[PDB]
């Protein structure tokens, strides 16, 4: 059984305005869009800017999305951005209730 | 029974330095004051800048306040700022352990 | 029994890239390094920038560290920076799942 919640701390979900405009798979790191305040895919440019993980896939036309706001996740189940800094990747969720480990 | 904790995830409280100088009702979104570091009413200008919800009303002369730091709240019980952007309102707590839904 | 977890809300830990290059004791407030994205000692310059508390001491040569990401801690057990603003100290963890009280 390949655990996707490589942690015991209960995972909880939340809903929020989505600013994503393209098919996005589940288990994708999310960040807040500085200009609109909507949740979009985490760009990997800053550690701690990832405020959530997509729970269900998005078609790209949804006005809202569902995300995990807490819990410990398996690094391998998460869909990271191409060639993301390893340090920013390790601390992507630092500051929130989310974390991830091997 | 009109639930005010439209969620199951346990709500927890915390205390912190208040920078509010006016009667403020309970269930009000709080943000950190950039200049002083004290907690004041959330201005609705940025998504994810709301770090807490006032638990008890403030006279406006308190040096400290009590706030919920986690849990899922009913959008309707929270006292939002006049004409706040709906997207910033939906994701006001994104990044923290707090969230809110209908 | 001098409680170090002056709270009931379960404490949880996480791992992350450390940017600390000197012996650092356990129970030390951590912040994210703007330039590298690595976790380093909280400088006390901003309220809410403390994203964690060191769980185990660091020699100063580790590439990773372990930190508590949630829970309520005793202000007295935490190792604060010399002459840190009291307001920024009180709200050092505001926004995260962490808090601290007497």
From Swiss-Prot, chains A, B, C:
Location in the cell: Virion
Pfam families given in the database record: HDPD (PF02924)
SUPFAM superfamilies: Head decoration protein D (gpD, major capsid protein D)
Entry keywords, A to Z: Capsid decoration protein, Capsid protein, Late protein, Virion
A GO term from the CC aspect: viral capsid, decoration
UniProt family annotation: Belongs to the lambda phage gpD family.
Protein name per its UniProtKB record: Head decoration protein
Organism expressing this protein natively: Enterobacteria phage P21 (Bacteriophage 21)
């Amino acid at each position: 059984e390949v655990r996707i919640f490589a942690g015991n701390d209960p995972a909880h979900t939340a809903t929020g305005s989505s600013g994503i405009s393209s098919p996005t798979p589940a288990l994708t790191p999310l960040m807040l869009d500085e200009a609109t305040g909507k949740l979009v895919v985490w760009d990997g440019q800053k550690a701690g800017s990832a405020v959530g993980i997509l729970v269900l896939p998005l078609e790209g036309t949804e006005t809202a999305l569902t995300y995990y706001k807490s819990g410990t996740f398996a690094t391998e189940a998460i869909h990271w951005p191409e060639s993301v800094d390893e340090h920013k990747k390790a601390n992507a969720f630092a500051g929130s209730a989310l974390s991830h480990a091997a």
